Amino acid sequence: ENPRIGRAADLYELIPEYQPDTYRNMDKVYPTRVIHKGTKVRPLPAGVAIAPRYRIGGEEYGVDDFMRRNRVGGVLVLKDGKVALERYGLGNDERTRWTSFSVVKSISSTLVGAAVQQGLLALDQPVDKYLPSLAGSAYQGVTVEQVLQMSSGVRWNETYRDPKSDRRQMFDAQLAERPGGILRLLASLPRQYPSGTHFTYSTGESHLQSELLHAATRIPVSDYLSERIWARMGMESDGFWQLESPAGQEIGSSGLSATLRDYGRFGQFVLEDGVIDGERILPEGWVDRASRVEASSHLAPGKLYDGEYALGYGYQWWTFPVGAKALPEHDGGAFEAQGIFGQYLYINRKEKIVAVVWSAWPKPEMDDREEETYAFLGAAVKALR
Amino acid sequence: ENPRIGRAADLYELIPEYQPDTYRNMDKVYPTRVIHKGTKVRPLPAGVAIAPRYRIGGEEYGVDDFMRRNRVGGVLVLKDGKVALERYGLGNDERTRWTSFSVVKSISSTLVGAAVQQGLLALDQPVDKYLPSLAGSAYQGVTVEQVLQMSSGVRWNETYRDPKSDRRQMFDAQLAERPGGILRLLASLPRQYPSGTHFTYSTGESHLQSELLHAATRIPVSDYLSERIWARMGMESDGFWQLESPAGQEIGSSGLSATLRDYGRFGQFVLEDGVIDGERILPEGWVDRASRVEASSHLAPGKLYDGEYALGYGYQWWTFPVGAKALPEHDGGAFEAQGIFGQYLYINRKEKIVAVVWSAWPKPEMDDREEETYAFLGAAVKALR
Amino acid sequence: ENPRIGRAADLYELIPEYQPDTYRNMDKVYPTRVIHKGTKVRPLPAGVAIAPRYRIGGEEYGVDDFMRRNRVGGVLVLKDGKVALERYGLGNDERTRWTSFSVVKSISSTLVGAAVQQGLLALDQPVDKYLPSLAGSAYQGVTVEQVLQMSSGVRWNETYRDPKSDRRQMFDAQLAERPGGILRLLASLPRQYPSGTHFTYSTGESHLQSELLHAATRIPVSDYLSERIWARMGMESDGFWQLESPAGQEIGSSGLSATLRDYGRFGQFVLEDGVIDGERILPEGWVDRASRVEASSHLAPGKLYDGEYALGYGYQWWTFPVGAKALPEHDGGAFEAQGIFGQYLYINRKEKIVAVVWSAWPKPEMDDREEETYAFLGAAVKALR
Ligand SMILES: *C(=O)[C@@H]([C@@H]1NC(C(=O)O)=C(S[C@@H]2CN[C@H](C(=O)N(C)C)C2)[C@@H]1C)[C@@H](C)O
Ligand SMILES: *C(=O)[C@@H]([C@@H]1NC(C(=O)O)=C(S[C@@H]2CN[C@H](C(=O)N(C)C)C2)[C@@H]1C)[C@@H](C)O
Ligand SMILES: *C(=O)[C@@H]([C@@H]1NC(C(=O)O)=C(S[C@@H]2CN[C@H](C(=O)N(C)C)C2)[C@@H]1C)[C@@H](C)O
Ligand SMILES: [Mg+2]
Ligand SMILES: [Mg+2]
Ligand SMILES: [Mg+2]
Ligand SMILES: [Zn+2]
């Protein structure tokens, strides 16, 4: 059959028949830059054999059930750096490169960490020091760490279904492909809270990470990701990264594509504290900082979204609750990247576990499928004890 | 020789040496989407050949003379589904894919027919129901039928060589490649007449068919054309369709490319009332409605352009006069698609004739070349009697 | 080896690791059109190898030292049409196509010359005769010759580093890829000096050569260059030329890529007075007018930039002083094209010498390295006497 690839403008409203083919062919739809691999590839050898089962409603389900019910296109579970489980669906295979959506927020964050290690960014510096086009804007004075914590205080209307929202204006900037358009949008925004006091999920603010990384390194973010990680630990396959315009700027908040085992290798890099062959790519304590759960902080689990989301926020990572509030099997400081339509990159340092889930849910957010994904993941964590 | 391909901005002004090469290489100039063929092809067996000859001035002319005088790059005459004539010129061959200009208006309209047959669009419904971008403009309340009949009554200046004309504006929006630029222009236009009362040929109004089709099916129009026609009856070759923007929206009013016999197959589809292998693709009575001649209607042949044009208008088809006013050998309810610089798709149901003409006239409109084409086609209809 | 290619917006600010790869891969960064070669290639036979040496400070330097000191990617010296010196650096070889920056202004000027020979342009005619969208602008009444001499009198701010300059707006128009955007900028500019009295280096005015060439020939400028010179002389390889937009208009002031020996062939065309195989392409006396040094002219050597620059101007060519103020070895009427970061095309008719220099200086203009380039070229001239 011919590939069913949607219009560029319809990415967030494709019919189910068009999602898998578009999600794995984003380079046919948007401008992109190649994230090059190297010549050495980090091995992912076979590991513990598991057949995880979980209970929901009153019924028991295995892996094929999970994948059928949630329209899952890929599942990878790494234990101790070794493949415990690897499945493909929806026509995907080991060579498929699938798009990240907001999962790439956590990759950008980790690269900011690499830039901190090199001295090229500092958490404490104001964003306008690196990005002079923000001079005079509400972002002037906001720090890099405040951007990482979605706590700039700049007013941001994220609702996609409001034609007037900032997220829709940013998506139209992308579709227009005029370089610097998102930055100009961000520079127009008024301030609403004191900086550092208020969580507002902003896809534009997350994009600012990509802008900062380019400004600090003076090379394309895709090449920095390659030199710091993709070619250094050794991913198996090139990736690629959606840009704002041709040969332009990577979208910091969305649009990275990679093989399933390469998403897993990135997770394994984070699980291993950023160390590749004895050299520290990430600052000492970076992963602890980026996934920190502090009871008094306004980012703590339970405290976001009027109190009815369970997960907190770190440096562009969602943080699982700890202690009495923990979700079953996800205690000990688990954290994750997520993207709409059911993309997950789950890291459990206590258990040395990395999980990657690729999905094509009909709708961008579905609470029952998120909760099912966590039940399935917790059953895998339980079976790997 | 390497191909002589014009700048994208110059499509309506190319010098004669750049016209044939550009018209068969439009995918090297503009963004395009592929119209996929199937694996079965509807045959076009050879019939009894014809060598029609006709008189102009005091001179008699064959097909070769006609081809030379009108700078014809292709002519195809089908008689009851069989090839009575097939000639190529200007360096074209059987595999050449030549652009349609406004001939695609009639393809889009027929796809609207297919959507009516599937219950996805209705002639009496307003266009802004399907196209929210039109709500609050002078198109609000205009019905799908009135769009097909170029009778919205919205003020539209079609003249090309005036820089500030609406047609030039819409071409500028295509050349900018911003998704939705054409719809934004259309939404900015004032009402001039009550709708359903006055014919105004508008290339933007005709594009609305493309936008309506995607809004009702939620798949690219190229893919709807493929599933409904191009892969169902089986064209011999892929087509392609010019877009407003990279991976964007098909131009409903211009810019489809296909081989000469695939244009013939589409004419045959219409001639055969939109049935393929016993399946109805078009509503019963669609072709009749779409080529309607009613003396009372403002659309009747002889009323358009305040009497100075012999042809009337249907559902984006031009209608030939019937009765006493018939042009020689074109009685019985013949109708046609046409495009500037000499493109024709002529359908004579009485005679069971489909004819395709590809030309590269130096100017977009030459009355004398139009008249000579009707004289040649009439000679061909006569020869096939 | 994956090339280190910058963001399109960063061309004038790349870090050194990114300059050589980007300069030879501009077709991966901007829209381009191919400049096609022909079927025959004009040979550049081997001559007597020279090993020029010159003294800077108190030190002897040869070709290798020149090259390592000024980060030179290529050097070609032709004497009487024969290769006296040919060296590649920075990873380049005989098939590299390296970008020209402003060197192409002199190519555009020479094509205007070709159009004057064919009668399609005239030096004393106003540019708004050929570009009607400049009627009513500061260019109204400005002649073709005045544009050639950078002497339109239109007010123009070249400052790259000022974000509001006209050069920045031009480059923004380019990045936004909207057809005709540069001409729109040009038509917005106010009058400053009476036309043909003062020299103001204007990248936009130089781009105007390209717009004029297309208006007067009605074919893409790349194809005109091909038919007049590239395919006729016999270049060795295709070139290509940066555009304003995909399949759009060539940038008249920047962005041509060619192999080293093909730049040499173009210089040799100029040196042979614009005749190829007995077919005169440039008007008699064109090279004379285009490189004129006339002490009473506002363009004479020593008059530009309040007398702070040794070189005068001609038809988009820089002219070396003659007489008592001649640079050593550079007397007799030498002239050159130059481009930022160290690109030179030097033509010395008296000595029958053509020199091409390709460099990747860290900064656009470094006076020190320019002076050293002229001392090295002078040493070549001496060695070639
Ligand atoms: C990333 O995939 C997109 C953004 N990510 C989310 C998200 O967090 O799911 C939203 S915002 C919206 C707020 N309430 C929901 C939520 O937080 N959860 C279900 C956890 C989702 C964006 C669409 C980005 C590509 O725009
Ligand atoms: C399609 O080819 C272009 C439009 N088609 C015509 C046309 O051929 O009719 C016009 S302009 C004007 C309106 N009616 C005149 C006419 O009756 N004939 C040529 C027969 C010409 C447009 C330019 C479309 C791509 O704009
Ligand atoms: C060409 O490479 C760029 C333009 N070229 C020049 C140039 O000729 O160096 C400049 S402007 C600058 C102003 N005065 C300079 C000079 O020659 N001296 C100070 C001695 C020339 C442009 C940037 C083009 C790509 O824009
Ligand atoms: Mg196993
Ligand atoms: Mg019905
Ligand atoms: Mg020769
Ligand atoms: Zn850069």
Ligand SMILES: [Zn+2]
């Ligand atoms: Zn309505």
Ligand SMILES: [Zn+2]
């Ligand atoms: Zn769609």
Ligand SMILES: [Zn+2]
């Ligand atoms: Zn043209």
